[PDB]
Design a protein around this ligand. Structure first.
Ligand SMILES: NC(=O)C1=CN([C@@H]2O[C@H](COP(=O)(O)OP(=O)(O)OC[C@H]3O[C@@H](n4cnc5c(N)ncnc54)[C@H](OP(=O)(O)O)[C@@H]3O)[C@@H](O)[C@H]2O)C=CC1
Ligand SMILES: NC(=O)C1=CN([C@@H]2O[C@H](COP(=O)(O)OP(=O)(O)OC[C@H]3O[C@@H](n4cnc5c(N)ncnc54)[C@H](OP(=O)(O)O)[C@@H]3O)[C@@H](O)[C@H]2O)C=CC1
Ligand SMILES: COc1cc(C[C@@H](CO)[C@H](CO)Cc2ccc(O)c(OC)c2)ccc1O
Ligand SMILES: COc1cc(C[C@@H](CO)[C@H](CO)Cc2ccc(O)c(OC)c2)ccc1O
Lengths: 290, 288
């Protein structure tokens, strides 16, 4: 009676949530167990902790193409969530080749969860374009910044915890960004992967109240701690260099506004499509850091 | 009404289990939040998943003395849990405890083969704790079950094999297999227990004292199949760098984890009959 899902990349940051949210939804959840890459003990107990919650384990190497055929034949829906910081993401081309040979897949949701690649501001679109080629029903989940990577640090780089003294502001901090608890991404991805309204579509994850400028997120923190931070404005060029952990990414989100420039309809916005998901406002999210 | 435990090494394999268990027991538990080595999602969240249970974080750096000092001044008992360079940063911690001296006990990092037996730098650390007047307890004696049970004492894997197996000697040496969670709960109980202050607490739960052959056969019975077994003897087992293979020797050929027994007054499973530890028959049902 269920939609059996296979979560590729089930032990990663975004992946492990999706496993969990799938199960919560009520899904016969499936995770891919890959030919071990060393003595990695976080990854192994993470893996086996899923079968206590209901999940099953499938064996597959990306080197072994028919292993991936065996994997995808046992499931109704694949969702991927592999590294993308990019030859990691392109492993998804092999997964597509196997899903195409199998043909029992009802929908395939690749690794997106963020900056729409279809615009101009990676090799994700390369992956979109293979899915559509083989004609695999799909759903693109895009449009949010990860709360752990962008809100908790007040968008500051090289760190993941609130600053205590001084905060860099890109531009005026009046570009509007979309900060979202990765837990809610997964829930949307889990509610959306079998919805009839979002098949073959792009799903935008723009919870309204978490549409915020930087300096507004910074005034959510300052109002929490009760201390004004020492703010330093940074203009475009003074931000352009010619390297550091992804700057071409920041710049488009925080200077160009590529995430909030085009508005979107209720028929394609996670919070509107799934109003029962009481997602998390950054005034609650930042609370763990006080 | 309760001691304050300050876990050190709180997001390491043993530490997170110790943090959870200190809270489970009911200690006002504190973790030591160390300046970012990196942008580490799984270190940062792990630390912040503790607060949500009741644990407090404390920022202190080992390149800073009164930092360590200030945090120890805040707790009754400190329990470190490090990874090797990593073991000898506990001296810097020993100088703060000593300089603070509000400390009632300090369980160093052990949880493995007791190094007292000759056959490390934990001894180095023991001699320091001791030469400083620190009450202590040395949790010692346990083979970690995730590192030696789920793989069935095979190397390079952490999950059962399917057909072939590798036996060390006659497979009739006894090794103390233990699931890490019981060590930690044993650790949570001992740290304020008058009866273990300034002792070495041993963790050899009777029913989990087994031999590889007895472990391979606990599984063999779980699957309903038998495993093509290959026996390796001493001389063939000694190479001329592969992941401390002196540990697998002393433990599986020399028997060092067992060649002596321990008064029940020093054995965790006797001091703590309430801990219903897990038998390797249960710990192994998860890989089925
Ligand atoms: N602000 C935002 O929106 C953010 C968006 N993203 C994107 O979200 C999506 C999720 O990615 P993310 O969680 O960050 O990735 P991670 O780096 O956290 O990797 C997590 C999982 O990806 C798989 N993985 C990594 N490397 C390999 C490899 N060589 N071969 C096979 N599998 C590999 C593994 O899954 P397994 O072991 O099961 O095979 C791994 O456990 C991506 O598209 C990513 O680019 C990334 C950063 C922030
Ligand atoms: N078979 C057995 O019985 C085994 C015994 N052991 C023993 O268990 C104890 C805990 O080790 P374990 O948890 O398994 O493995 P880990 O080495 O993975 O512990 C990791 C944690 O130790 C801290 N750490 C790592 N490097 C440093 C460093 N230079 N300086 C300060 N802290 C550091 C960090 O804590 P944080 O960042 O939170 O401050 C890190 O999160 C050890 O003493 C070990 O001897 C471990 C292996 C097997
Ligand atoms: C919005 O969507 C996406 C966002 C990203 C963000 C990546 C960019 O490489 C990294 C994290 O992996 C963000 C980061 C970089 C450096 C930092 O110092 C930093 O502080 C924590 C955070 C990748 C893909 C996306 O589709
Ligand atoms: C039981 O006593 C102890 C045991 C240990 C285990 C250490 C030895 O270096 C290593 C990791 O550090 C574990 C390991 C070794 C080889 C392997 O093939 C292996 O694969 C799972 C894992 C340390 C301290 C102890 O007191």
């Amino acid at each position: 009676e269920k939609t059996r899902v296979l979560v590729v990349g089930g032990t990663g940051t975004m992946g492990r949530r999706i496993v969990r949210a799938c199960l919560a939804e009520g899904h016969e959840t499936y995770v891919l167990q890959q030919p071990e890459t060393r003595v990695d003990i976080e990854k192994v107990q993470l893996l086996y902790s899923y079968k206590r919650l209901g999940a099953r384990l499938i064996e597959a190497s990306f080197s072994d193409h028919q292993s991936l055929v065996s994997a995808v034949k046992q499931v109704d829906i694949v969702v991927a969530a592999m590294s993308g910081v990019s030859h990691s993401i392109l492993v998804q081309l092999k997964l597509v080749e196997a899903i195409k040979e199998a043909g029992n897949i009802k929908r395939f949701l690749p690794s997106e969860f963020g900056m729409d690649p279809s615009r101009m501001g990676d090799q994700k679109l390369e992956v979109r374009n293979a899915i559509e080629a083989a004609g695999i029903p799909h759903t693109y989940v895009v449009g949010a910044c990860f709360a752990a990577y962008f809100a908790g640090n007040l968008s500051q780089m090289g760190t993941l915890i609130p600053p205590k003294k001084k905060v860099n502001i890109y531009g005026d901090g009046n570009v509007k960004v979309v900060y979202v608890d990765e837990d809610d991404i997964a829930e949307y991805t889990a509610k959306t992967l079998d919805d009839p309204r979002t098949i073959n579509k792009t799903v935008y994850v723009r919870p309204t109240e978490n549409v915020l400028t930087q300096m507004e997120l910074v005034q959510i923190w300052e109002k929490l701690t009760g201390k004004e931070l020492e703010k330093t404005n940074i203009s475009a060029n003074d931000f352009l260099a010619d390297h550091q952990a992804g700057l071409g990414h920041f710049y488009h989100i925080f200077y160009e506004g590529c995430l909030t420039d085009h508005e979107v309809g209720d028929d394609e916005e996670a919070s509107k499509l799934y109003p029962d998901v009481k997602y998390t406002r950054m005034d609650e999210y930042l609370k763990i850091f006080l």
